[PDB]
Amino acid sequence: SALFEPYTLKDVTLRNRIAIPPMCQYMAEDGMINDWHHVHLAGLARGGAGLLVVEATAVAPEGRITPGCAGIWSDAHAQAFVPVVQAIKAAGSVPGIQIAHAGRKASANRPWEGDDHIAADDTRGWETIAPSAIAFGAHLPKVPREMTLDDIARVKQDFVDAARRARDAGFEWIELHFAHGYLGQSFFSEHSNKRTDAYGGSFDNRSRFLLETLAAVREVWPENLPLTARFGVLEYDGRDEQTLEESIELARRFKAGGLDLLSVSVGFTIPDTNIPWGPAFMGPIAERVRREAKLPVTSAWGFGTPQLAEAALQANQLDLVSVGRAHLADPHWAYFAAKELGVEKASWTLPAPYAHALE
Amino acid sequence: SALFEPYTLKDVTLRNRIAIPPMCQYMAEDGMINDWHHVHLAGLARGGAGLLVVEATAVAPEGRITPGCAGIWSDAHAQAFVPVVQAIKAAGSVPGIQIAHAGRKASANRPWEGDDHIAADDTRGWETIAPSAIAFGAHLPKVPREMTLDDIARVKQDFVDAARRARDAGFEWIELHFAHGYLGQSFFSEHSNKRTDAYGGSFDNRSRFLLETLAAVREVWPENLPLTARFGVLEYDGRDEQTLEESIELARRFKAGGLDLLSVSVGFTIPDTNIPWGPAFMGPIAERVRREAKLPVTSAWGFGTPQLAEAALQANQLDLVSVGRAHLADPHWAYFAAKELGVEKASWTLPAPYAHALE
Numbered sequence A, B: 001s002a003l004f005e006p007y008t009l010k011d012v013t014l015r016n017r018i019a020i021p022p023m024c025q026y027m028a029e030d031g032m033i034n035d036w037h038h039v040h041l042a043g044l045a046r047g048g049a050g051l052l053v054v055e056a057t058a059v060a061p062e063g064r065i066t067p068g069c070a071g072i073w074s075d076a077h078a079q080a081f082v083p084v085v086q087a088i089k090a091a092g093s094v095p096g097i098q099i100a101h102a103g104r105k106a107s108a109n110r111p112w113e114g115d116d117h118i119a120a121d122d123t124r125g126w127e128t129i130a131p132s133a134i135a136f137g138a139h140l141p142k143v144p145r146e147m148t149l150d151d152i153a154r155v156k157q158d159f160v161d162a163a164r165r166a167r168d169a170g171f172e173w174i175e176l177h178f179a180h181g182y183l184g185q186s187f188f189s190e191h192s193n194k195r196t197d198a199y200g201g202s203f204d205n206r207s208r209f210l211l212e213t214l215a216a217v218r219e220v221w222p223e224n225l226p227l228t229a230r231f232g233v234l235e236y237d238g239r240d241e242q243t244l245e246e247s248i249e250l251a252r253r254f255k256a257g258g259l260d261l262l263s264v265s266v267g268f269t270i271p272d273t274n275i276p277w278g279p280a281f282m283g284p285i286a287e288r289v290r291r292e293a294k295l296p297v298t299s300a301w302g303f304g305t306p307q308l309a310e311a312a313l314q315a316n317q318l319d320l321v322s323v324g325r326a327h328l329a330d331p332h333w334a335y336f337a338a339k340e341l342g343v344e345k346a347s348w349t350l351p352a353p354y355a356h357a358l359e
């Protein structure tokens, strides 16, 4: 079975092609993770997946999506991750972390608490920042503050500081969050970036924030650990061919700049779009990025059906398959998949206290 | 749905009728539990089950089944349980613990390490104790040492000390392990008890160890928390009618002595038997105990099929349904069951970080 072949990138070897993508839990306090996270991530690692990527973790307080997002903007935040990282490794999974800045989508409620921008006079909120003073709209109406050149320097450094802490906390895999309408995605897109300086206008200028952040992170992140990013390569906004072309060009530059793998997504930069949701609908897009940028990719959305994950791999649309929600429903999804695909001794996808009992 | 109605016993209210029965993990060192246990049990509680009973935990070093069994034979062992108990409560589940002494079945290997009595010159082994110097046979050939009256006093006190620690560590539910061929079961059965003193021979004498242990535990265990036990009511050894009669009589005495619920099992006292394994095969037996001793019961074996658990309840064969292995395969089995039985907003069987995403 292809889903259960190992995968080697730099010095890191995943035991199978199952990746658990970053999924926010909204359970942190002041950026600090706790026993929710520890048990959640520990449980997931024991489930069998080859790689577990920790949720979007803010490089700065204002870059949190919500008041419950994790953070890594201080050495104390980083140190909180240490036991969890060690528990993930103990379970045989590779610990990864996505580091992030939510840009104009920041200062919002938890999804079960309105999922919308925090009210003006709610003491939990904060001013958001972005390339340009334009609001997302819809449920996120707040107009962000336009970043100064010093803001841009500071955020870039926040990312470096974040990667450095991530490295020292023991993570073996890092993912830069340049997707889903957040800060990085918003610099690339013309919908959200109307800057007239070095960081807006042309393709080279809109790319600049993302490329510089990568290069600066590369300086602290170990050469021998996969350096990756997530990136919305299209919007389904009626400009897909041209957006894809530019996104693929940028992916080529990422690769040239040391990016080992690209997590391929949709931009979600603006609300007025028409996304053709469906099981593995991202496969064909992911496959085009892989071919044309000649770069390993993962993607997600509906791969919780084990045969679908298997086909994506055999067709070389993906190098790893990211399975999100199915892992929230069943932390042992990898075991479910092994059984479904007929893996020999499938119960030994799990640790011995479970495996012996289930064979 | 009956499986998802709450259940009140003394001052304790379970949020549904799903019980996770004690399942040994064999991951403790010198009786001390660790992060395996913490994450395992924490994960299970968040899964949705109303009650989570911690694995057979030894009241004395020699009463462990294996070198990896948990123990509660010192205040330090008990204190190790404290964080786990608090994590279980935080998740909305009721923390229970089964306290145990493996009798002649003690000093054995982990199931994936031979599952058999430890070799003579293996430094991990120890002498076993029992009512009479007779070996189980088969894979457990060691002849136990015949207990003195002082051994019996000491073990009884170990059980009291165990319940006391369990109480102080915060458990809200206790289960005495008088089943599966272990010490308690071995005092009741004529196959294993050939004593000619006050603790062997007649029904009153064979019952004595179990009844005294209960009464002594009752002295320290809070009146307002369910006091329960697990008990093999038959052997499938060709003596089932008479064994059942005596077992039911004992259950009546348990009830008269303060037992709030009885976990009904098979004795497993000897190997030469013919167990009619099948989905919910214990239902009819459990139901007879319930009727004739007029005592709430749970049982297990194959109730991981949600409709089977539901039927058992509607037919009043059981008051709680114990689901073991299915929870090792999927810690979120209760959520699986809610969906299968059509529970309204089934995803909210899980905590918000999962539930909101899965609705």
Ligand SMILES: Cc1cc2nc3c(=O)[nH]c(=O)nc-3n(C[C@H](O)[C@H](O)[C@H](O)COP(=O)(O)O)c2cc1C
Residues within 6 Å of the ligand: A021, A022, A023, A024, A025, A055, A056, A098, A177, A179, A180, A230, A300, A301, A302, A303, A304, A322, A323, A324, A325, A326, B353, B357
């Ligand atoms: C609760 C929830 C939280 C998520 N948090 C993040 C995140 O922090 N960063 C990110 O890139 N994607 C995040 N995602 C997107 C997922 O990584 C994944 O792409 C998505 O769930 C689709 O894959 P699936 O069908 O397997 O669920 C999140 C998704 C969900 C449902």
Ligand SMILES: Cc1cc2nc3c(=O)[nH]c(=O)nc-3n(C[C@H](O)[C@H](O)[C@H](O)COP(=O)(O)O)c2cc1C
Residues within 6 Å of the ligand: A353, A357, B021, B022, B023, B024, B025, B055, B056, B098, B177, B179, B180, B230, B300, B301, B302, B303, B304, B322, B323, B324, B325, B326
């Ligand atoms: C690994 C494993 C460990 C178990 N440990 C214990 C135990 O410590 N005490 C006990 O009474 N039963 C123990 N049991 C028996 C279970 O509680 C339960 O009765 C059994 O698994 C059958 O139910 P099920 O079909 O839902 O698995 C254990 C069972 C298994 C598979």
